[PDB]
DNA sequence: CGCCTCCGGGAGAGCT
DNA sequence: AGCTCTCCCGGAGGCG
C-alpha cells in the first residue's frame, strides 16, 4: 500500500520497488535527464508526500537506496 | 468497439488494426513463433469469441488479411 | 513536478 | 509440454 520511498499510497511496482505514481516519473527522469542535484542540508531530508519535491537529491538517494533500477 | 478478427470487444489499435487483447498476443506469437499451422477444416474456419482457439491457421491468415503488421 | 492516455510486451495461471 | 489470455508495468507523448 505504501511507497518504500516517500510513504505515500503506492501505485505498483516499479522500476523494482513498490512505489508511487510520482516517485516512478521522478526516478525515470532523474536518470534518463542525467540531472545531478544537490542537498542544501546533510544528505538527510525528509522525503514524504509534503516535503518530496524539497530535495531530488535526497529523494532519488533514497529512490537508490529502496533498490530502484531502470531496468528490473 | 469490435475486434477486426475475432469480434470480441476490441481494446484498441493493436499492430495496425482495432483488435482485442487475445489476438493482440496470439499475432505477436504466431508472427516470431515461425508457425506451420495446418486448418483442419477448408481454410474457412469462423473465428470469434468462443472460436478462436480452434484454428491458428485461420486466425492468423484473418490477422494478416485485416492488415497486422510487426511495423506498427 | 504529477498526471493523463495509448499501445507494446513480460509473466504466470490455467487449460489442453 | 504448448497455447491462451488477463494482469501488470514499460515507454512515448502530451498537459496543466
Ligand atoms: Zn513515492
Ligand atoms: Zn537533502
Ligand atoms: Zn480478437
Ligand atoms: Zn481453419
Chains 1, 2 share one sequence.
Do not use: W
Request: with cysteine; aromatic share 6%.
Amino acid at each position: 500500500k505504501l511507497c518504500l520511498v516517500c510513504s505515500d499510497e503506492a501505485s505498483g511496482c516499479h522500476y523494482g520497488v513498490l512505489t508511487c505514481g510520482s516517485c516512478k516519473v521522478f526516478f525515470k527522469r532523474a536518470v534518463e535527464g542525467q540531472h545531478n542535484y544537490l542537498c542544501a542540508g546533510d544528505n538527510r531530508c525528509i522525503i514524504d508526500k509534503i516535503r518530496r519535491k524539497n530535495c531530488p537529491a535526497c529523494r532519488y538517494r533514497k529512490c537508490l537506496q529502496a533498490g530502484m533500477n531502470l531496468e528490473a
